[PDB]
UniProtKB/Swiss-Prot annotation:
Modification Phosphothreonine occurs at: T146
Disulfide pattern: C3-C30, C126-C156, C159-C168, C163-C176, C184-C191, C188-C199, C200-C208, C204-C216, C219-C228, C232-C259, C263-C275, C279-C295, C298-C300, C304-C329, C437-C466, C473-C482, C477-C490, C493-C502
Family, per entry: Belongs to the protein kinase superfamily. Tyr protein kinase family. EGF receptor subfamily.
Native source organism of the sequence: Homo sapiens (Human)
Annotated glycan sites: N45, N151, N223, N492
UniProt modification remark: Autophosphorylated. Autophosphorylation occurs in trans, i.e. one subunit of the dimeric receptor phosphorylates tyrosine residues on the other subunit. Ligand-binding increases phosphorylation on tyrosine residues. Dephosphorylated by PTPN12.
Cellular compartment(s): Cell membrane; Cell projection, Ruffle membrane
Tissues in which the protein is found: Expressed in a variety of tumor tissues including primary breast tumors and tumors from small bowel, esophagus, kidney and mouth.
Subunit text: Homodimer. Heterodimer with EGFR, ERBB3 and ERBB4. Part of a complex with EGFR and either PIK3C2A or PIK3C2B. Interacts with PLXNB1. Interacts with MUC1; the interaction is enhanced by heregulin (HRG). Interacts with KPNB1, RANBP2, EEA1, CRM1 and CLTC. Interacts with PTK6. Interacts with RPA194 and ACTB. Interacts with PRKCABP, SRC and MYOC.
Protein name in UniProt: Receptor tyrosine-protein kinase erbB-2
Function: Protein tyrosine kinase that is part of several cell surface receptor complexes, but that apparently needs a coreceptor for ligand binding. Essential component of a neuregulin-receptor complex, although neuregulins do not interact with it alone. GP30 is a potential ligand for this receptor. Regulates outgrowth and stabilization of peripheral microtubules (MTs). Upon ERBB2 activation, the MEMO1-RHOA-DIAPH1 signaling pathway elicits the phosphorylation and thus the inhibition of GSK3B at cell membrane. In the nucleus is involved in transcriptional regulation. Associates with the 5'-TCAAATTC-3' sequence in the PTGS2/COX-2 promoter and activates its transcription. Implicated in transcriptional activation of CDKN1A; the function involves STAT3 and SRC. Involved in the transcription of rRNA genes by RNA Pol I and enhances protein synthesis and cell growth.
Sequence ranges on the Extracellular membrane side: 1-504
Disease tied to this protein: Glioma: Gliomas are benign or malignant central nervous system neoplasms derived from glial cells. They comprise astrocytomas and glioblastoma multiforme that are derived from astrocytes, oligodendrogliomas derived from oligodendrocytes and ependymomas derived from ependymocytes. Ovarian cancer: The term ovarian cancer defines malignancies originating from ovarian tissue. Although many histologic types of ovarian tumors have been described, epithelial ovarian carcinoma is the most common form. Ovarian cancers are often asymptomatic and the recognized signs and symptoms, even of late-stage disease, are vague. Consequently, most patients are diagnosed with advanced disease.
Length: 504
């Protein structure tokens, strides 16, 4: 399956302790990173058991402020450069340990289409200077600012003697870094290794079992039913006998680097045969009965854009200046978040403080194509009643690249977000909110749309205390499982459907 990666920059940690639960759950079973990736501020001993699962990166990779000794993202293969880190880097590492990372082991991560590498002093991390970044940068990627900081606090074990060119992401032979550019003999765009024999079909992306397009492991172009072409077999082709158009029985959509007859949830099928997360200019959304979402050429509707999009690419949190961009639409094509700075605004610009009464603007927000992140929230609100109708979070863009929903350090006593059973991509994070219950009372078992979610909880109210209060779900509820107190907070109404109403 597919999920986004993280996006921290200078953002508030949501919860080092709960980041652990989050990362395991998000990555588990995820082969593809949507957008970017950034792992920061994790606990020294976090059990990040699923990070290795993901095979692809679309945006930048940051590791910073991270006390974790190991962050095992070993399968990541290519970086498509969809967004750049602080608009310039494909990868970055910063202050990753006061604890701290020893090695990254990103053995498969061989390609950067856009972006440089920004590394600062890493007290525990080594082997970042044993990477042939020159090779990693794509043949046509000249946006390759490279800064390798070898300022460390420890002795470094030599790079395994078993690595070609002693190129590695750690001291073990399991950490050897593959070379896919400087060995592209014959002038091929990308290769698996030295000589034309080991060039990849030009549709491939630094990973193939050979020169044929049926044999690509990763693609620049797209794997239609596993086979790479510049573009997918045209959705509509034509008959050269008359040269008139006709539907192509083999027509497919460029789903990320893959190509399909129908796109898995949250992907947008264009009429040029592509499957994006983001609509190209003048491409309107339509949703198919099979879950394929579309971005077909316009004669265009008005679209409200959230954080991470267009002129809002600069902001990862909502401020007062963003009110008119994020309001008036039932869905936001992008993300929204409530950070201490969202509430503080910008004292330097003499702005007004956020008024809690304006958070009711999301009452009709059925869908977020991005994220909902709250780290700052009025304590006058015991729950998220303003988001109860938020049935869908697509997660094309996630806060901190992970959160479909963040509730950290809040005054809310329950979640109460009755309709959010459709999580296209991402995780909720519950942290430092010792007033919160129902974390383990919602029948999460039946509320997931993909395998990227599981039970998460740190520094929230202990269930033992919620139990001490005599808390339980109302008898109207099947299984007794709910999101808040009372019969309306249950995932269903188990009794009689009589015409217009559910009654006991």
């Amino acid at each position: 399956q597919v999920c986004t990666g993280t996006d921290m920059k200078l953002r508030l940690p949501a919860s080092p302790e709960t980041h652990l639960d989050m990362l395991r759950h998000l990555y588990q079973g995820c082969q593809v990173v949507q957008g970017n990736l950034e792992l920061t501020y994790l606990p020294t001993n976090a059990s990040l058991s699923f990070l290795q699962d993901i095979q692809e990166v679309q945006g930048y990779v940051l590791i910073a402020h991270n006390q974790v000794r190991q962050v095992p993202l070993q399968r990541l293969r290519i970086v498509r450069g969809t967004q750049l880190f602080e608009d310039n880097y494909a990868l970055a590492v910063l202050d990753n340990g006061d604890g701290g990372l020893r090695e990254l082991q990103l053995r498969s991560l061989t390609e950067i289409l856009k972006g440089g590498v920004l590394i600062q002093r890493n007290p525990q991390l080594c082997y970042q200077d044993t990477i042939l970044w020159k090779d990693i940068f794509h043949k046509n990627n000249q946006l390759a600012l490279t800064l390798i900081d070898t300022n460390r606090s420890r002795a470094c074990h030599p790079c395994s003697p078993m690595c070609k060119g002693s190129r590695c992401w750690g001291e073990s032979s399991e950490d050897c870094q593959s070379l896919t550019r400087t060995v592209c003999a014959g002038g091929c765009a990308r290769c698996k290794g030295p000589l034309p024999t080991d060039c990849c079909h030009e549709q491939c992306a630094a990973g193939c079992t050979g020169p044929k397009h049926s044999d690509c492991l990763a693609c620049l172009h797209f794997n239609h039913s596993g086979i790479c072409e510049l573009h997918c077999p045209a959705l509509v082709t034509y008959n050269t006998d008359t040269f008139e158009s006709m539907p192509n029985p083999e027509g497919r959509y460029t789903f990320g680097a893959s190509c399909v007859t129908a796109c898995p949830y949250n992907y947008l099928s264009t009429d040029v045969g592509s499957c994006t997360l983001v609509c190209p200019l003048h491409n309107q959304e339509v949703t198919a009965e099979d879950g394929t979402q579309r971005c077909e050429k316009c004669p265009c509707a008005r679209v409200c854009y959230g954080l991470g999009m267009e002129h809002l690419r600069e902001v990862r949190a909502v401020t007062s200046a963003n009110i008119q961009e994020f309001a008036g639409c039932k869905k936001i094509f992008g993300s929204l978040a409530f950070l201490p700075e969202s509430f503080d605004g910008d004292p330097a610009s003499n702005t007004a403080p956020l008024q809690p009464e304006q958070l009711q603007v999301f009452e009709t927000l059925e869908e977020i194509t991005g994220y909902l992140y709250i780290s700052a929230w009025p304590d006058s609100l015991p729950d998220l009643s303003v988001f109860q109708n938020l049935q869908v979070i697509r997660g094309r863009i996630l806060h901190n690249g992970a959160y479909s929903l963040t509730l950290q350090g809040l005054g809310i006593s329950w979640l109460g977000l009755r309709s959010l059973r459709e999580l296209g991509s991402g995780l909720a994070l519950i942290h430092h909110n010792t007033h919160l219950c129902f974390v383990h009372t919602v029948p999460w078992d039946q509320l997931f749309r993909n395998p990227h979610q599981a039970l998460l909880h740190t520094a929230n109210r202990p269930e033992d205390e919620c139990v001490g209060e005599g808390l339980a779900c109302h008898q109207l509820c099947a299984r007794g499982h709910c999101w808040g107190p009372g019969p309306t907070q249950c995932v269903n109404c188990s009794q009689f459907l009589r015409g217009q109403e559910c009654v006991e």
